[PDB]
Amino acid sequence: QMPSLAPMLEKVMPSVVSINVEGSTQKFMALGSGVIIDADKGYVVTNNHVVDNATVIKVQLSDGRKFDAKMVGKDPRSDIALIQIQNPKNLTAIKMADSDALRVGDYTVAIGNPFGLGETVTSGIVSALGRSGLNAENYENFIQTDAAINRGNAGGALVNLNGELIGINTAILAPDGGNIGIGFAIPSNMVKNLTSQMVEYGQVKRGELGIMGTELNSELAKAMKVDAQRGAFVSQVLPNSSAAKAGIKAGDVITSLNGKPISSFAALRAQVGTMPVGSKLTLGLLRDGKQVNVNLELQQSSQNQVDSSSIFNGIEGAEMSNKGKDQGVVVNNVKTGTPAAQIGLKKGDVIIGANQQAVKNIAELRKVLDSKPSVLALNIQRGDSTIYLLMQ
Amino acid sequence: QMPSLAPMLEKVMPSVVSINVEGSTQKFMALGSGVIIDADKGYVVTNNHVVDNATVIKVQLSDGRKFDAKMVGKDPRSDIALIQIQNPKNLTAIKMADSDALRVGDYTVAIGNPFGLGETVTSGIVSALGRSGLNAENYENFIQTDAAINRGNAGGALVNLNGELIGINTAILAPDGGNIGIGFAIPSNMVKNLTSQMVEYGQVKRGELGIMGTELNSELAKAMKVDAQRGAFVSQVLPNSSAAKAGIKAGDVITSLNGKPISSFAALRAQVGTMPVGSKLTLGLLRDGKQVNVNLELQQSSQNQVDSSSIFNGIEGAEMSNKGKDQGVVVNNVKTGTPAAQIGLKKGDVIIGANQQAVKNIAELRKVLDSKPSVLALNIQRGDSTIYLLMQ
Amino acid sequence: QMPSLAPMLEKVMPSVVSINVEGSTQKFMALGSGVIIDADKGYVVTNNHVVDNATVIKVQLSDGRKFDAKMVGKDPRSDIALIQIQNPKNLTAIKMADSDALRVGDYTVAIGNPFGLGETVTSGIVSALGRSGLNAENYENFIQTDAAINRGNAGGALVNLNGELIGINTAILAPDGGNIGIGFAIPSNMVKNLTSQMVEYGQVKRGELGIMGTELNSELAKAMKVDAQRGAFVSQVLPNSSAAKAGIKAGDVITSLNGKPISSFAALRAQVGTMPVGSKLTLGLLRDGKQVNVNLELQQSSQNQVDSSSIFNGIEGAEMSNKGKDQGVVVNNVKTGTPAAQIGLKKGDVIIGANQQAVKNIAELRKVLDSKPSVLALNIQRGDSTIYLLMQ
């Protein structure tokens, strides 16, 4: 009688699907993996970079079945995209684990589609936690593992021995485009927060404390007479920000969030970066070697805007986001001499509906384009006037 | 008291030898691994591609001892070759496991000679089963694993935690000629069937059902109103074939073999491709959404022929195979302007003996060449006449 | 309740630090890993090739803290260097395991700083023991493992499941500069012997049996009517050597050392090569198929000398080593037209002190240079005369 991962995998494997994609920007073809998050609705999480600029998206289960899927949401900053299987029949979803309970040394299993071979399983351990720096503009709080990960594994599952999702495989460190024992996955907690938003609104409503800062290193801790050699150093706090109102002052060092210690400023940024606006949280602070606790509430941010090419697959030069709560899709900013402004679009406009269907958020709008009508008729409102924009 | 593979390996390791080779086609040198299958006779399985075109073959045990070995059999199509240690003393053979009982997630151990370093052990898990496509003309039903495999590991052992052989390491997927976590081994069941033939006859007597077909994918299953998204689709059945006699009709889908479900057409081809002629088997079929069962018996095939260069190490342009049962080595086909026809050889000839020794099959013939006589004197028969061909 | 390495790692990880280096020979920057061996004194073992030619050495603990370290000792031949943290506060040292009790198949954990990412943990097994040949002039008796090892892992820890050090990661076999499942570590026993010397004297006092020899292979064993296919073959024994006095004769084969069987001549060389002079040992010998036992005692050797560039960071062309016991640092040999002889230095000189501080060995001397005085004033003695050499 031998130890084996097989019993655990029999239940878990159907939960991991593989994504095939065709797109354009000049035609291309790509492939990766995805994880079923809601069996009934057919929701499937995956990497944003796998499904970015995709005209066609098809999903293949472990048992051979093929489905077509449509984009639901996407977040370039965290590299997480949510798609939806069309006509979801008899699916199996994965249960998610609490990634905050992960320790280095814990065992891991990776499941995905390397080089299109098909559903492939590999094993390792958690090598490190809170890794970041791959792209300093992205929100990254990676789990690192030595379970083999290669091209095609992206969007695939990283699970513990109990077949619970702890992460989504996103990247590797490889000088040769081949795995050398260093892989990175997005923690499952971040996935829980980002996807649950996309499901309802079509995008993520980003919150902010309103503080500038940098990594607290040992040298900086000497200059500042601080004991801790790690944490978020508050460079400054913006006026009229939640942080200011809360009582946070510059020269402060943030050591914990909601009880959980903080690896770094980068990690902290990644935590709050995924939480919805109006979230009640609490911070551990260190000022003058004295421990402080504070109650905060996330607020509106300037990072909400997303490009129009992301929604019309080829219409560049217009950023736009949800408005208030279910009040339509307001256009944030418009660039001159671009495909968007060529049909009339101007910043300040608020899309009320399209083709006689009401539009409250980006999801409802995307739901009309999924229909793929020959002509698109937007009912926007400029100032006190209602107008229409026709496409094609 | 710590868990360890060491106790298991102490028994198993002597069973894995490493093969050194010199050959020509222009001299070359290669090296790999092999597994002792019969300690008494000194039989050693290995990859055909390791010992192909070899003039000299030497085997080195784990304890340092060297032996010379001679070719017994070889199958390019499945990439399995059988050699024999000369003067076998005090060897240790490996027990074989039933590879049909393998599950993805099961633990694996690989043992071989990477880069000539010596007996090396690495570990992983079964990543996938029934992988094929590396070469569409070969019979491939690979076990895939993330246990490290590199150049020199070929012909080496893949075992379970109980030190039973489950596969023979053959290949890897590596853009850089270095392992990235994707290795392939030939299932131990296929090895059991192929080698047991080579031992007795010097080659494999291939059987065939006599059916054309292709992979059953989801799209094809829609066209054909079939429920299964995987299996072998019968394009057509050859007249006077075992399949025809059995009651198999085109548009059928094969779902099982001898009870065991079928991964693919490729796998099925690989299963029967290794079974000896006259084997009694049974197939699960699906026609018009109705389950069928059928009793079949393998029959003669056209794939039996092998090149003459394979036996004379440098005599090209004459294919030949065993004849009936122990009736000599008949020549299948002869090409013009080739080294073989330059000594007289013509297709239709039947080698009765060589150098006053009787020849019943290719093994007995190879046994005379192992002697390495200065002049080779073949007693062949063309029509009703007996003649002789001299070599060197 | 899941199995995990996390509990073991929590204790062990602080024991592994990462080393940053700046040097010159033309400025360079390198990085690797190191292991804390004595928490109180702040001793840290690492690879010689990591800290070679270093002007600045800084050490970063797991918790973020930075320290400066200074060279204590270094051995190019075994590739082991010892450094010392300056102002050691609240450190955690690692317990060492007996590497002679290692078996292939035993589980291993690697801990180091690949590509500067930070403290990274990976896992594998012992693939092989006593590997050597990477550099035939070095003393190598490597443990081989498939735990992922990459650039930056050097000097890092290799431990068993109990968090005991079994080796120090030194090298990998990689055609692409990326890990493919083949890593090498220096056994912990060799580290125990080499470092304990450097701590006291600043270098290793090498001992020798005084015997020429080569690897005993199967072919050589045939020629010599020997049964063993492995061991050290005595080509000849030097007169007035410990071996000669002991009763060792050419044509002998050494099979054991202090009871422990011998993998190879290379391994044997590596064992005694790390033992201090005057060590009492015993050898198992085979002569004329008869088992012999012998009592030996290591003696002075010619390999003691080390370059002057190693101690003055840029002063080439003068070899020098300790003298007798704590009698100063004698200069072995001097080359003409070199930076050393340009200040006067001549072979035969014995450094009694520097800058009014007494000098007994290379460690005490290195301790004066750690002060980094503007001018260095050596009190050497040529013949019966005492003189001084000034620097800068």
Q: Tell me if A169 sits within 8 A of A156, measured CB to CB.
A: yes
What is the DSSP track for B256-289?
EETTEE-S-HHHHHHHHTTSBTT-EEEEEEEETT
- Do B148 and B102 share a structural domain? yes
| Residue type for position C292 | V
Residue C169 token pair: 């990661």
Q: CB-based contact (8 Å) between A3 and chain B?
A: yes
SS3 A159: strand
**Cα C353 from Cα C360, distance rounded (Å):** 8
**Cα C15 from Cα A72, distance rounded (Å):** 47
Residue A178 token pair: 């081949």
Which of residues A94, A121, A147 is at a domain's end? Answer: A94
- Do B192 and B99 share a structural domain? yes
**Cα B119 from Cα B156, distance rounded (Å):** 10
Contacts by C124-128 with C-beta closer than 8 Å and gap 24+?
Answer: C124/B122, C124/B123, C124/C148, C124/C181, C124/C183, C125/B5, C125/B121, C125/B122, C125/B123, C126/B6, C126/B121, C126/C102, C127/B120, C127/B121, C127/B122, C127/C182, C128/B117, C128/B118, C128/B119, C128/B120, C128/B121, C128/C104
Judge whether C274 lies within some domain.
Answer: yes
**Cα C162 from Cα A138, distance rounded (Å):** 38
Judge whether C65 lies within some domain.
Answer: yes
Q: Which of C274, C22, C52, C270 has the alpha carbon at shortest distance from C155?
A: C52
Q: What are the φ/ψ torsions at residue A222 (nearest 5 degrees)?
A: -70, -50
- Do B344 and B315 share a structural domain? yes
Chain A's closest residue to C8, CA to CA, is A105
**Cα B165 from Cα B150, distance rounded (Å):** 19
Q: CB-based contact (8 Å) between C3 and chain B?
A: no
Element holding C373 (H helix, E strand) = none
Burial per residue of A327-366, b for 16 or more beta-carbon CB atoms within 10 angstroms, e otherwise: ebbbbbebeeeebbbeeebeeebbbbbbeeeebbbbbbbb
Q: CB-based contact (8 Å) between C74 and chain B?
A: no
What is the DSSP track for B324-376?
TTTS-EEEEEE-SSSTTTTTT--TT-EEEEETTEE-SSHHHHHHHHTT--SSE
Q: Tell me if B345 sits within 8 A of B389, measured CB to CB.
A: yes
Chain A hits for B146, CB-CB cut-off 8 Å, are: 122-123, 147-148
**Cα C257 from Cα C238, distance rounded (Å):** 20
> Could C162 and B119 be called an inter-chain contact, meaning their C-beta atoms sit closer than 8 Å?
no
Q: E strands, B1-102, where?
A: 16-24, 27-38, 43-47, 54-60, 66-75, 80-85
Residues in chain C: 392
Q: Residue B223: CB partners within 8 Å, gap ≥ 6? A: none
Q: Kindly give the interhelix angle for B362-369 and B188-201, rounded to the nearest 10 degrees.
A: 70
In angstroms, this model's resolution equals: 3.0
Residue C119 token pair: 């403290």
Q: E strands, C221-368, where?
A: 232-237, 253-257, 260-261, 280-287, 290-297, 306-307, 318-322, 329-334, 350-354, 357-358
Q: What are the φ/ψ torsions at residue C375 (nearest 5 degrees)?
A: -120, 135
Closest Cβ–Cβ partner in A13, A65, A150 for B218:
A65
Burial per residue of C219-234, b for 16 or more beta-carbon CB atoms within 10 angstroms, e otherwise: eebeeeebebbbbbbb
């125990």: which residue's tokens?
A: C192
- Do C307 and C228 share a structural domain? no
Chain C hits for A173, CB-CB cut-off 8 Å, are: 114-115, 117
CATH number of the structural domain spanning residue C328: 2.30.42.10
**Cα B179 from Cα C174, distance rounded (Å):** 10
Closest Cβ–Cβ partner in C65, C114, C117 for A218:
C65
Instruction: Please indicate the experimental technique that yielded this structure.
Output: X-ray
Question: Any idea what the Cα angle at residue C35 is, between residues C133 and C164, rounded to 5°?
Answer: 85
Strands C107-112 and C54-60: unpaired
Partners of A295 in the β-ladder? A282
Element holding B386 (H helix, E strand) = strand B385-391
Q: Which of A252, A219, A218, A217 has the alpha carbon at shortest distance from A233?
A: A252
Closest Cβ–Cβ partner in C105, C126, C146 for B148:
C146
Phi-psi map region of B344: left, alpha, beta (phi>0 left; psi -120 to 50 alpha) = left
Q: Tell me if A157 sits within 8 A of A16, measured CB to CB.
A: yes
Which of residues B153, B174, B206 is at a domain's end? Answer: B206
Q: Residue A133: CB partners within 8 Å, gap ≥ 6? A: A140, A266
Chain A's closest residue to B123, CA to CA, is A123
Q: Tell me if B361 sits within 8 A of B322, measured CB to CB.
A: yes
Residue B313: CB atoms within 10 A of its CB come to 15
Cα separations in angstroms, C142 against A2, A174, C45: 31, 26, 17
Residue B59 token pair: 């085997």
Q: What are the φ/ψ torsions at residue B53 (nearest 5 degrees)?
A: 60, 40
Q: CB-based contact (8 Å) between C175 and chain A?
A: no
**Cα C81 from Cα C203, distance rounded (Å):** 10
Judge whether B1 lies within some domain.
Answer: no
Q: Residue C258: CB partners within 8 Å, gap ≥ 6? A: C281, C282
Give first-to-last CA distance, chain C, whole Å.
66
Q: Residue A264: CB partners within 8 Å, gap ≥ 6? A: A130, A132, A215, A216, A230, A231, A232
Judge whether B28 lies within some domain.
Answer: yes
- B92 exposed, middle or buried (CB, 10 Å; 0-12, 13-18, 19+)? middle
Closest Cβ–Cβ partner in A6, A66, A149 for B106:
A6
């390996």: which residue's tokens?
A: B9
């031949």: which residue's tokens?
A: C77
Number of H helices, E strands in chain C: 8, 25
- Do A268 and A239 share a structural domain? yes
SS3 B313: coil
Q: Kindly give the interhelix angle for A188-201 and A362-369, rounded to the nearest 10 degrees.
A: 70
Q: Tell me if B59 sits within 8 A of B34, measured CB to CB.
A: yes
For residues B127, B131, B134, B135, the Cα torsion angle rounded to the nearest 10 degrees is: 160
**Cα A285 from Cα A249, distance rounded (Å):** 10
Q: Tell me if C382 sits within 8 A of C371, measured CB to CB.
A: no
Q: What are the φ/ψ torsions at residue B127 (nearest 5 degrees)?
A: -90, -30
Judge whether A151 lies within some domain.
Answer: yes
Judge whether A2 lies within some domain.
Answer: no
- Do A317 and A216 share a structural domain? no
Whether the CA torsion A46, A49, A50, A54 is positive or negative: it is: positive
- Do C310 and C387 share a structural domain? yes
Q: What share of chain A is helix, strand, coil (3-state, %, to 5)?
A: 15, 40, 40
Q: Which of A303, A263, A299 has the alpha carbon at shortest distance from A281?
A: A299
**Cα B109 from Cα B123, distance rounded (Å):** 5
Closest Cβ–Cβ partner in B5, B122, B178 for C174:
B178
What is the DSSP track for C223-250?
HTT-S-SSSEEEEEE-TTSHHHHHT--T
Q: CB-based contact (8 Å) between A182 and chain C?
A: yes
- Do B217 and B194 share a structural domain? no
**Cα B305 from Cα B298, distance rounded (Å):** 17
> Could A181 and C150 be called an inter-chain contact, meaning their C-beta atoms sit closer than 8 Å?
yes
Q: Which of B315, B320, B322, B289 has the alpha carbon at shortest distance from B391?
A: B315
- Do B174 and B79 share a structural domain? no
Tell me the H-state helices in A137-262: 188-201, 218-223, 242-246
Chain A hits for C114, CB-CB cut-off 8 Å, are: 173, 181-182
CATH number of the structural domain spanning residue A51: 2.40.10.10
Residue C238 token pair: 């030097």
Q: Residue B187: CB partners within 8 Å, gap ≥ 6? A: B99, B100, B102, B141, B142, B143, B166, B167
Residue B230: CB atoms within 10 A of its CB come to 21
Q: Tell me if A35 sits within 8 A of A82, measured CB to CB.
A: no
> Could A63 and B229 be called an inter-chain contact, meaning their C-beta atoms sit closer than 8 Å?
yes
Q: Tell me if A44 sits within 8 A of A17, measured CB to CB.
A: yes
| Residue type for position C133 | G
Partners of A380 in the β-ladder? A351, A387
Q: CB-based contact (8 Å) between C123 and chain A?
A: yes
- Do B290 and B309 share a structural domain? no
Domain that holds residue A353: 301-392
SS3 A24: strand
- Do B155 and B187 share a structural domain? yes
**DSSP for residue A369:** H
Please tell me the total count of domains within chain C. 4
> What is the Cα A358 distance to its own chain's centre?
27
> Could B173 and A115 be called an inter-chain contact, meaning their C-beta atoms sit closer than 8 Å?
yes
**Cα C25 from Cα A26, distance rounded (Å):** 51
Q: CB-based contact (8 Å) between C107 and chain B?
A: yes
Q: Residue B89: CB partners within 8 Å, gap ≥ 6? A: none
Q: E strands, B138-259, where?
A: 142-145, 157-159, 165-172, 183-187, 211-215, 232-237, 253-257
Q: How many angstroms away from the CA of B6 is the closest CA of chain C?
A: 4
Q: Which of B100, B105, B107, B72 has the alpha carbon at shortest distance from B86?
A: B72
Chain B hits for C265, CB-CB cut-off 8 Å, are: none
**Cα A387 from Cα B9, distance rounded (Å):** 78
- Do B194 and B221 share a structural domain? no
Element holding C378 (H helix, E strand) = strand C376-382
Residue C27 token pair: 């400025």
Judge whether B7 lies within some domain.
Answer: no
Strands C232-237 and A66-75: unpaired
Judge whether B312 lies within some domain.
Answer: yes
Which of residues A94, A127, A151 is at a domain's end? Answer: A94
Closest Cβ–Cβ partner in A2, A120, A147 for B144:
A120
SS3 B215: strand
- A325 exposed, middle or buried (CB, 10 Å; 0-12, 13-18, 19+)? exposed
